[PDB]
Amino acid sequence: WWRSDSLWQAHDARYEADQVCVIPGTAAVAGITRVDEPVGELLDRFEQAAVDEVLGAGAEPVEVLSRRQARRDASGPLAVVLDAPDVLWAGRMSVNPVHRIAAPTEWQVREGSDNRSASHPSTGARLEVADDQHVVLSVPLSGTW
Amino acid sequence: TPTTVDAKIVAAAANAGHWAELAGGGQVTEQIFNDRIAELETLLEPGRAIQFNTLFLDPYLWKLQVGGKRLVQRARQSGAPIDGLVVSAGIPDLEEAVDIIDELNEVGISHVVFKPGTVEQIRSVIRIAAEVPTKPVIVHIEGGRAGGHHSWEDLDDLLLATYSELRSRSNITICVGGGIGTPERSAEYLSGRWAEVHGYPLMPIDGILVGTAAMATLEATTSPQVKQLLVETKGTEAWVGAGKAANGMASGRSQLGADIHEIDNAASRCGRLLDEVAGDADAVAERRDEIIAAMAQTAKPYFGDVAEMTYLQWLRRYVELAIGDGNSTADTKRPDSPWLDITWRDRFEQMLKRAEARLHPQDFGPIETLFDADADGERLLEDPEA
Ligand SMILES: Cc1cc2nc3c(=O)[nH]c(=O)nc-3n(C[C@H](O)[C@H](O)[C@H](O)COP(=O)(O)O)c2cc1C
Q: Which of A19, A88, B214, B341 fits a 20 to 30 Å CA distance from B47?
């Protein structure tokens, strides 16, 4: 009777909060000081200071950090097609057809590998991928003609 | 459970560009939980994706999960944004884990999440990893220094011993968690420098989870007074065995006997009394005066003397406890808040209808046929005093 459903009073309750079971951890509490600090701030605070510590010693103003403020990338259009397993259509998530296009294809062709802009990946399933209008990646599949 | 159950915070955390797990301990049905995902996907901006957390503890939830997993299956068969599943409090057996991994929603699962608490539990997941070597498995290694569900197992020694075998599987993503509020203290586990204190060569980690430090956050539904309470609590170094409130933190056992880390400074009355009552139950009748008054101190009120108490006092006590004046249950019903107590309002009705059932000498024609009408009865309900 005492311990049942004791976790909900910590949220949206006007009652004295010294009567309530509220759940922290022991050692993590020390790291808890700032109150009503947005989630985005705390999680970034972790990432941003982890970056600085990694940057300063080993990286020392790395090309990766400089490329970011200047907008340069890893995994360009050709890689992105072969990387992300999820293919979005509207608000729905689908599996990457290239996963089933790449290997199962009888004849698979990667056109102009080292050159990014002209890069093309085609298959005997009749599915071909190329880039158009910069960031837009164009996948072209065909049935018969 | 309390924190991430709100669709608002898990969305806001994801909209900040971060991975998060929607709590399942606050959702008792497929339908009620499907509302949350719908509220999530609405607050989810384009493309953004979240995961789900489930508990192994009791059979009813595991039977509910059969409907729950098929709900997750149906959702992702419909193409739902939720990209992961988290099994908690225990590690499913191989045949149980294979099912989860191989579900119709599998691609939408994209990885499976397990939380080993013991050396044996770790070795169990390794066997789940070798089961499907091509399926990503994120192994979150927690402590008992963590919050909520507890354990007697050290943070280091477990990972210290089992790390080598964990790295023989490429599909295993090692994630250390517990007792971490900051990037600075958690940086050494990432570099692998943390194992050097124990003499073991560098032992890097792939990821880090923060449970506790995110509770005082702005978008969290934690009450203003409760947040201030979590704050003023002083923290500690490596957990100590001696029974006490330790840095505003003392362990306590749930109804099933498993330990729970709760705040014993912010609230010192519930936890310590519970330990008193627990260790004291043979002679409870003798300490009854001491025990029954302490329930009233923590606001777990018994009723005034049961016989002598007037039916009003009965019916007025339920209204007192169930109906908040500040939140205005009538005004609480209009937004359609999930905090709605409606079973409590239905509880009070069955008591009211029992009161008419108890005192009426006649055929019960006039009274019962009135209060039972929808339009009539619901209007009578929103006005408890009347
Ligand atoms: C209020 C609260 C509720 C929690 N609920 C669950 C849960 O339902 N399932 C679970 O596996 N872990 C749960 N946890 C544990 C966290 O998922 C995480 O493992 C732990 O909090 C990390 O340790 P730390 O917060 O002390 O750093 C909960 C923790 C807290 C504080």
A: B214
The residue among B161, B143, B163 whose CA lies nearest residue B153 is B143
Q: A84: which 2 tokens? A: 């992300």
Smallest Cα distance from B373 to chain A, Å: 32
Exposure of B35 by Cβ count < 10 A (0-12 exposed, 13-18 middle, 19+ buried)? middle
Long-range pairs, B291-295, Cβ under 8 A, ≥24? B294/B269
Give the C-alpha separation, A82 to A96, whole Å: 8
Q: How was this structure determined?
A: cryo-EM
- Interface check for A25 against chain B (CB to CB < 8 A): the answer is yes
Strand-pair category, A86-89 with A92-95: antiparallel
Q: How far apart are CA B189 and CA B32, in angstroms?
A: 39
Quick one: closest CA in B to A2, which residue?
Answer: B300
Q: Which of B44, B41, B12, B42 is nearest to A39 (CA)?
A: B12
Q: What Å resolution does this PDB entry report?
A: 17.5
CA distance B321 to B345: 11
How many CB atoms within 10 Å of residue B222?
Answer: 27
3-state helix, strand, coil in chain B (%, to 5): 45, 10, 45
First vs last C-alpha separation in chain B: 37
